[PDB]
């Protein structure tokens, strides 16, 4: 069984600067393509306290924040501030009149509603109005931060125990869907720690703790990405704009006949994603195992390449297609028909198994190195999470579990090259600045846009900008 340990994928950071770590590369070289006078205009929706609280945290962020403990300085870095050592080379400013205030009564009204689904719908309608008012030429915010009070988030977000669906409405998913036609990305934050909220289940009680420097890194990187700026670029050695990575996924509607709908998540080496919605899917058994016909896969790939051409003005030379389910013969046929028609002669079809039970185990307390790759006779065991030499530790606690990559026979590239690209694609991050993520960006975006698009009626045109789904 052949085994390799891939190097941590390198990133290009601007002025040709190259580094494996998004944070250190930004500190040393800045972002990829900065323009003099760059500024991210940040709108704020919240109460008088949370608005003032967010303004305070943005100020400490601008001044610079020291690490809590520099023993693991790469995992727990300082934030150098937004002045002379600005890692984003960009100003983060709340314009005048770019804040909408939620009244104390409006917060209490929602907390007091007895039925959870009605509380979510009332909260979504309230925030959508404040969002729309902020975009009525009051200012032109590039991204709007939603600083809801702690009790309001606890009302809207279900709790799961420290140890550890659609029965209840998801506030975040409904909010992102109901505000998608407004062309603003939003960032929901806890008003005490200022990290991401409403994306995962919360705890029953909020801790009073800190790692303020890390939370500053994550918040600005999320606002940076949402504003549309490129922090760095992947695959620096490879010529840019040559290869594109087309994820194909499915989500299931809740009403009607619970039909599945195909989605496309295409990313470039600059981490920018284009989201496209295809035709309804077939299913193999009892409405499960969604799949596309050859005509529908052909249509979806063609619509995707056309959107790539409308934004980048040229057509990719290679297209790597990623799926979390095996490629049906119809899907492989439709992908080939669409690509050959457009003159794209290079293609790889990779089946990415998230839940394979196959694993390998080293002797000791630390887990396998991230980047370890084991060839299992045409199937690639790839450890996207695990021990990270750059961090000097294993950043998790529960053991990691590898991806299993199965390339289709129609693929042009060797298994080891595709696994290294999948490893590199895990670095595209819109939520944290820690690069040891499990899934490559095209597959991650599939799950995220599926939870949102099932609240938008089929047939309605949707924005292709992935940054507005994050």
């Amino acid at each position: 069984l052949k085994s390799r340990v891939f190097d941590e994928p390198m990133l290009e950071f601007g002025d040709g600067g190259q580094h494996l770590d998004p944070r250190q590369g930004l500190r040393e070289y800045g972002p990829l393509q900065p323009r003099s006078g760059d500024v991210v205009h940040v709108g704020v929706i919240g109460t008088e306290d949370t608005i003032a609280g967010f303004s305070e945290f943005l100020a400490e962020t601008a001044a610079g924040i020291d690490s809590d403990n520099k023993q693991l300085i790469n995992l727990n870095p300082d934030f150098p501030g937004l002045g002379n050592q600005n890692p984003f080379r960009c100003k983060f400013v709340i314009p005048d009149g770019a804040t909408a205030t939620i009244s104390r009564r409006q917060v209490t009204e929602i907390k007091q509603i007895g039925r959870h689904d009605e509380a979510v719908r009332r909260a979504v309608a309230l925030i959508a109005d404040q969002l729309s008012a902020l975009m009525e030429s009051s200012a032109k915010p590039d991204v709007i931060v939603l600083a809801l009070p702690v009790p309001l988030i606890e009302k809207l977000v279900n709790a799961k125990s420290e140890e550890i669906r659609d029965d209840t409405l998801n506030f975040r998913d409904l909010l992102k869907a109901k505000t998608l036609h407004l062309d603003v990305p939003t960032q929901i934050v806890w008003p005490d720690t200022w990290d991401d909220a409403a994306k995962i289940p919360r705890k029953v009680k909020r801790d009073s703790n800190q790692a303020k420097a890390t939370r500053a890194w994550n918040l600005l990187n999320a606002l940076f990405y949402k504003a549309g700026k490129v922090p760095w670029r992947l695959l620096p050695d490879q010529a840019e704009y040559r290869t594109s990575f087309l994820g194909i996924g499915f989500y299931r509607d809740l009403d009607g006949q619970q039909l599945w709908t195909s989605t496309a998540q295409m990313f470039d080496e600059r981490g920018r994603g284009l989201i496209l919605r295809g035709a309804r899917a077939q299913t193999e058994t009892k409405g499960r195992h969604p799949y596309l016909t050859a005509k529908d896969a052909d249509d979806l790939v063609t619509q995707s390449i056309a959107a790539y051409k409308a934004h980048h003005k040229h057509v990719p030379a290679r297209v790597v297609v990623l799926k979390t389910s095996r490629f049906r013969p119809e899907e492989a046929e439709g992908i080939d028909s669409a690509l050959s028609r457009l003159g794209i002669e290079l293609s790889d079809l990779v089946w990415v198994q998230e839940s394979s039970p196959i694993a390998v185990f080293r002797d000791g307390n630390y887990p396998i190195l991230r980047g370890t790759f084991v060839d299992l006779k045409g199937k690639g065991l790839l450890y996207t999470r695990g021990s990270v030499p750059y961090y000097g530790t294993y950043p998790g606690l529960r053991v990691p579990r590898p991806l299993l990559l199965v390339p289709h026979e129609n693929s042009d590239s060797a298994l080891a090259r595709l696994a290294e690209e999948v490893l590199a694609l895990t670095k595209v991050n819109w939520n944290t600045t820690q690069f040891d993520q499990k899934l490559p960006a095209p597959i991650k975006a599939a799950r995220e846009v599926g939870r949102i698009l099932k609240h938008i009626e089929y047939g309605v045109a949707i924005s292709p900008d992935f940054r507005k789904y994050t």
Binding site: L1, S3, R4, V5, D7, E8, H19, L20, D21, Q24, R27, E28, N69, K70, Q71, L72, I73, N74, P77, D78, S161, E162, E163, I164, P357, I358, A359, V360, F361, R362, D363, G364, N365, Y366, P367, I368, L369, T372, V374, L376, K377, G378, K379, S387, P389, Y390, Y391, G392, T393, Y394, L397, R398, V399
Partner: protein, 414 residues
């Protein structure tokens, strides 16, 4: 020959490094020498200080370096050796050692880690490596807590075990048609007879088993005139979806009977688990981990309350015309060892939260031991074969990390 000579040069260099006030840490081997790290040492307490310098020793017996006189010489650097430190941001020095004269010369080579300056210039006067270099080396060290600095994985690599065991099928498998559509429909007919057993599959009117169905009570559920023994290679290694699915199903039920003395199967949870033998009483399983015997409490009772059983998910996967069983350890909870707990999910999340690598690896070894052990003398149709260890090219620096990582204790299996 290269190895020994390298340990000679490393030993000479290590001896000087300790006299100079540094700690030496071996890291790996090289073409003619070794790879290691130098760390500043508290002179009184002997504690490490956190200032690092990478050291590569190259040794030779009685050989003359390039263009060597009595005043100096030159040396050609090996890029593959220096590349082990390419991104570490740790300064690197080379130390040339010779056995004839016992000479030790050193040179700072960080600039050659990130470039193509392969020609080195040595001055035998100023480039001597001996305890007098404490100040020079100390000024070259980098802080371990400098942003961007990290210790690279060990270039010698390490081994690892996979959760796959090769299955050796019998040469013959028995084909038949059945009056019943599925095995579920055939069980009540089977229970009407004696000499019964359940390591067989009936799906879509077709029957498969590794034993002869006519020699047991299974004759009542098959078309006896259509029983036929074929080469199991043809059934188990073809492109027919019905045949590969029935192979996976027959392999599982055969395994279930073969391990029935120790573990039972849960149909809903799709889990093999060590069953209890008495209510509210624990028991252990004895297996061989490495060269040493060890015991695992596969049934652990917590007196009133619940009883925790070692469990595992079995997947049968085909790889290049060979069949394998995959083992994925977990746990299963009962109220008293038999009656299922009415809230197991909460208990599984409790035990899983604290699980770390050593515990997970040990459970894989134990379950693989239980599988192989059932083939020898504990009716036995499947043999199991351990795979060779995986040779990984780079190894986790665990020894270094247990000193330096403040979270090394969080990785321990309690």
């Amino acid at each position: 020959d290269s190895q020994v000579l390298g340990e000679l040069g490393e030993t000479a260099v290590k001896k000087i490094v300790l006299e100079t006030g540094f700690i030496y840490e071996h890291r790996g081997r090289l073409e003619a020498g070794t790879d290691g790290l130098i760390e500043l040492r508290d002179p009184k307490s002997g504690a490490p200080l956190g200032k690092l310098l990478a050291v590569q020793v190259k040794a030779t017996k009685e050989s003359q370096y390039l263009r060597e006189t009595d005043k100096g010489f030159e040396y050609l650097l090996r890029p593959a050796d220096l590349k082990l430190w390419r991104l570490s941001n740790i300064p690197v020095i080379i130390v040339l050692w010779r056995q004839s004269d016992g000479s030790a010369y050193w040179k700072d080579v960080t600039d050659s880690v990130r470039g193509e300056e392969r020609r080195l210039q040595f001055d035998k006067a100023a480039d001597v490596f001996d305890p007098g270099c404490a100040d020079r080396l100390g000024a070259l060290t980098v802080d371990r807590r400098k942003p961007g600095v990290f210790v690279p994985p060990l270039n010698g690599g390490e081994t690892a075990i996979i959760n796959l065991l090769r299955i050796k099928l019998p040469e013959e498998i028995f084909i038949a048609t059945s009056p019943f559509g599925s095995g579920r429909d055939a069980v009540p007919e089977l229970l009407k007879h004696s000499n019964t057993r359940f390591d067989w599959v009936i799906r879509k009117r077709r029957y498969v088993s590794f034993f002869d169905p006519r020699e047991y009570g299974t004759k009542a559920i098959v078309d006896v005139d259509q029983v036929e023994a074929i080469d199991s290679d043809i059934f188990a290694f073809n492109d027919d979806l019905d045949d590969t699915n029935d192979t996976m199903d027959l392999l599982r039920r055969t395994v279930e009977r073969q391990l029935s003395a120790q573990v039972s199967y849960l149909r809903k949870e799709r889990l093999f688990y060590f069953h209890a033998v008495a209510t509210n009483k624990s028991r252990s399983y004895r297996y061989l981990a490495n060269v040493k015997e060890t015991s695992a409490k596969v049934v652990s009772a917590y007196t009133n309350g619940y009883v925790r059983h070692h469990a595992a998910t079995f997947r049968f996967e085909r790889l290049a015309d060979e069949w394998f069983v995959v083992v994925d350890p977990t746990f299963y909870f009962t109220n008293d060892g038999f009656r299922p707990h009415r809230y197991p999910e909460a208990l599984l999340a409790g035990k899983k939260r604290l699980e770390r690598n050593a515990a997970v690896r040990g459970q894989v070894v134990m379950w693989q031991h239980l599988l192989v052990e059932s083939a020898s003398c504990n009716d036995v149709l499947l043999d199991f074969e351990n795979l060779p260890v995986i040779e990984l090219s780079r190894a986790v620096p665990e020894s270094s990390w247990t000193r330096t990582d403040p979270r090394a204790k969080e990785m321990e299996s309690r």
